[PDB]
Amino acid sequence: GFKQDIATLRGDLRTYAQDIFLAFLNKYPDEKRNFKNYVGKSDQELKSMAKFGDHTEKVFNLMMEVADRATDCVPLASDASTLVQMKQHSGLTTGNFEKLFVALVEYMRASGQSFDSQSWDRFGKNLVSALSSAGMK
Ligand code: HEM
Numbered sequence: 001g002f003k004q005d006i007a008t009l010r011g012d013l014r015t016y017a018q019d020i021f022l023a024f025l026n027k028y029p030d031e032k033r034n035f036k037n038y039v040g041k042s043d044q045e046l047k048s049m050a051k052f053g054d055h056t057e058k059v060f061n062l063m064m065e066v067a068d069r070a071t072d073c074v075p076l077a078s079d080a081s082t083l084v085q086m087k088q089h090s091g092l093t094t095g096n097f098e099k100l101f102v103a104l105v106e107y108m109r110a111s112g113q114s115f116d117s118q119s120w121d122r123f124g125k126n127l128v129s130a131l132s133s134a135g136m137k
């Protein structure tokens with residue numbers, strides 16, 4: 001289920017963090033407007049870039065903490081407000097997050113593995129609802 005999925009993802013975190021972000025960027029190429037240093041690069045080139053590895057892993061480390069602190073796939077309001085108020089998230093709207101979780105769920109469905117994709121799909125919708133309540137446009 002969802003809890004075990006958090007353990008599975010954490011057990012190969014750098015790999016999953018990079019592969020899910022690439023799935024997102026490749027499914028939604030327009031989302032690179034937010035990541036101009038990643039333009040004009042193949043996946044293997046991005047996986048050679050120090051900030052792409054560093055940043056993807058720090059993002060996913062916090063994503064897994066947000067998921068782990070959730071009840072029934074509903075994140076804490078404190079975690080939603082941290083994600084809205086972060087200076088690095090000044091430009092974003094909830095649609096950026098919806099798209100990320102669509103790509104994450106698709107990734108999991110396409111994997112060989114028994115991820116609980118329906119729990120991740122809920123988590124993404126509930127995180128979007130929480131971000132909207134905490135003031136993200
Ligand atoms: C639950 C999902 C997310 C979490 C937990 C999260 C977390 C973080 C964290 C911890 C950082 C700091 C990274 C560092 O400085 O090394 C960061 C930066 C950033 N995040 Fe988020 N983020 C999420 C979703 C998103 C989404 C959906 C977008 C845009 C589509 C986004 C855009 C950014 C940008 C532009 C930065 C700063 C620039 C950069 O680090 O390359 N984030 N995020």
Ligand SMILES: CC(c1ccc(O)cc1)c1ccc(O)cc1
Binds near residue numbers: 059060
């Ligand atoms: C959107 C986010 C991310 C999405 C999915 C992941 O598995 C890891 C990270 C992100 C933020 C800043 C970056 O520099 C790189 C990526």
